[PDB]
Amino acid sequence: ATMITSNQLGTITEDSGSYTPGTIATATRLVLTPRETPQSITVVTRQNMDDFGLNNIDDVMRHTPGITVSAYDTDRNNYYARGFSINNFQYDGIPSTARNVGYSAGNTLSDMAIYDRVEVLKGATGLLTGAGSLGATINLIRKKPTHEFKGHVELGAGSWDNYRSELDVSGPLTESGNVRGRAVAAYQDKHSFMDHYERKTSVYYGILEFDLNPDTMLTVGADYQDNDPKGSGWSGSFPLFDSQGNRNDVSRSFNNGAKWSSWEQYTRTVFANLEHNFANGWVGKVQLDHKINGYHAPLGAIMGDWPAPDNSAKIVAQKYTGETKSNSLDIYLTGPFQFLGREHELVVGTSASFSHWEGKSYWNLRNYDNTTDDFINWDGDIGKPDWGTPSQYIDDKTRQLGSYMTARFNVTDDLNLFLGGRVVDYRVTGLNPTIRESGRFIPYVGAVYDLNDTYSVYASYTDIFMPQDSWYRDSSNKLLEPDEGQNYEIGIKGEYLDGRLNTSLAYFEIHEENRAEEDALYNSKPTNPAITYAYKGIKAKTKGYEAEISGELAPGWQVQAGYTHKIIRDDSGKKVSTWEPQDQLSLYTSYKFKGALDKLTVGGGARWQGKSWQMVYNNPRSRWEKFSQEDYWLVDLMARYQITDKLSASVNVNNVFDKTYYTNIGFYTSASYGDPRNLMFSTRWDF
């Protein structure tokens, strides 16, 4: 018929083995091609994740172009987006409130085995997502059930006793098709080059659809991922400084962690939602959502200038437990709007979210000896001390509301205007100095002009803010106004062949307001409660350019790659985010062969980042020290052979040259090495 392989969220990727995307509504909730989208965008398709064996999300952020994957500890990584740290995840267009990573749970790792694509929206997301963070907003998208039947089961084992396996099954459940359903689940247990670390995750998910015509699908389902790591290290992989001695040298596989230390993060969620097709040529969607992010973290690790002369080092132990539920109501109407001349479109919409995070933390240990026989050569084996009584409780509930409305006017059959905004109110009624904000306006303004039938240009003023935590207060005792910012963008995009190939390069400049910087002088802290410690709020500026291609480079030649020049400093200040390389080159590509051996595909890619540095502190000598990560040229090859019409055979080797490099260097004075040469064989479906 009208060839509906697309949808509300936008044309799917589990088909067109083309690394380039189809239509993303992730920006204005209004379906649009990339070119028709006036904000910087970069998306990892499914045929891409597949080719390179990008199993968990991390394995995507590493391969996403423009983003930098830095680490904290074994089970915690951070994503760098345009000078800032990405901290906004949007599942099927829905944001999440597992905001704080100190008590991280679920976000930094989601087995892809269930999504069709992960669309990252660079710039200022505020329009759709409420309070959030500058940089980018990740946006996973689940697998929606297939009309005709389809499914598969994949196995596969990689290095360090890395074994995994999923199973995808979808189709109709009644002749007519009034009802369609899909179920998928995967299992993965792997160790690591690092000693005693052996995490195992598992994910189940079931989604279904209920037709009735314009009484369009009352689709519903629920997913659940469970990460139970053991031997989890914490903050870095090893302490940068020994007792007082200079630097510390240690195997690529040392692990400050405790054999028993682990950071179990789990997330289960349920959604329900029915879309409706109105006759005016308009459609309105309504969705409910119940999700929960819990965390079971009984950490145990050795930290702090510790390889002491007598070869022994003390170790901090601490336990953190917590779950955090959330309900979300999001309804929206989006369709053709006649004003004059020709039809335009609006997308009136309002949302609501009721979260509730409660949790404990134990660090008032009892009857414990945290000293260790010897440092060097150690398999993080120490007693799992008895955590006394919770030493800090947590009972906070946030009620973020807000309504929005976006306009896609077109003065000319080339130039279209984007007027619109999202107002909002934030309420975090909890156990600490109650705070809330309301009536703040987040604006959305952009326009695209169609030059040749090919290239086109856009400009944009995206915005976003974030009511800050209570920790942050100023000289007096006021929580520095919310951390806000706007992304000033201008670039030109270009598509070729209905949308098989797609290019774009733009100039983005971000301006940060009230950035939370630790007040300095303030040691001679005068009486007032804000006493002890207080931060100040100073302005920051982030400017840079970005360019990346993606799509059908030839006949069956897929390629996606990008380069990004970034620089960020604070009011006539220094360079902040010195770890996120000022320049980065990402290039990934696969080619299927012609006739001769058209039963074989080959691919590979490479990333590059210029000098990376951090500013630590050598307590033992008080003298501050610099640390730089020379250069980065990482390459990885892949290959896959379709031996039978139904049954694939492939193999990826992720760090060809085995580049001994650093992933983090200035975290609480630690460091973590980099996945040395990976290797993973796989086999596709059937029997």
Partner: peptide, 8 residues
């Protein structure tokens, strides 16, 4: 940042 208490 975020709030509390690894060694201090």
């Amino acid at each position: 940042x975020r709030x509390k208490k690894k060694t201090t």
